[PDB]
Write a protein that binds this ligand. Structure first.
Ligand SMILES: Nc1ncnc2c1ncn2[C@@H]1O[C@H](COP(=O)(O)OP(=O)(O)O[C@H]2O[C@H](CO)[C@@H](O)[C@H](O)[C@H]2O)[C@@H](O)[C@H]1O
Length: 162
């Protein structure tokens, strides 16, 4: 009630706000990180998540990658929550700057469905340069679990809330 939000369907609610704030307010959830293949959390929401954890997320990510190697585009890994959420699902969206196809978002978003409540940004809609409407369409097509999709730009919110 205390956020600008639009319920899209039985599963998906679009929220104008801060994903970390929204994950904090929910008693139980997974928070999704829009990550890169090497889980190097230098910027974007990955940066905000890592900094909110005081670097704990990067420490854990480094251990995962150091031992297990880089992820493939479209893959995800469930890691610890570091007090931000019950767990963080690191999802590697396609980077359009590197000619990676938006259709790989299908794989990203299908990974949500085994989790009861998910708080997510729009995957690949930041520097990975996928149209927010396209990302959101892939989300709605593939996500069947209770999901709060959080955007921090009112203009993008308004466009998607149509
Ligand atoms: N509450 C909220 N707060 C902040 N942002 C919110 C938000 N809710 C949604 N977002 C948005 O979520 C989006 C994520 O999109 P991307 O997949 O493009 O990020 P990316 O994969 O590039 O990050 C990766 O981008 C490059 C990859 O090389 C790396 O430097 C970086 O570390 C890695 O995370 C951004 O628009 C971000 O603003």
């Amino acid at each position: 009630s205390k956020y600008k939000h639009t319920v899209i369907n039985n599963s998906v609610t679009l929220v104008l706000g801060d994903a970390i704030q929204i994950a904090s307010l929910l008693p139980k959830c997974i928070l999704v990180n829009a990550a890169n293949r090497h889980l190097k959390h230098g910027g974007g929401i990955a940066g905000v998540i890592n900094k909110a954890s005081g670097g704990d997320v990067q420490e854990e990510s480094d251990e995962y990658i150091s031992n297990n190697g880089p992820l493939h585009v479209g893959d995800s890994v469930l890691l610890k929550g570091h007090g931000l959420a019950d767990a963080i699902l690191h999802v590697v969206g396609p980077d359009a700057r590197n000619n990676e196809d938006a259709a790989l978002l299908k794989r990203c978003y299908k990974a949500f469905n085994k989790h009861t409540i998910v708080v997510t940004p729009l995957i690949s809609a930041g520097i990975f340069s996928v149209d927010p409407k396209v990302s959101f369409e892939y989300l709605l097509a593939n996500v069947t679990t209770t999901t709060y999709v959080v955007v921090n730009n009112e203009d993008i919110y308004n466009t998607l809330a149509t």
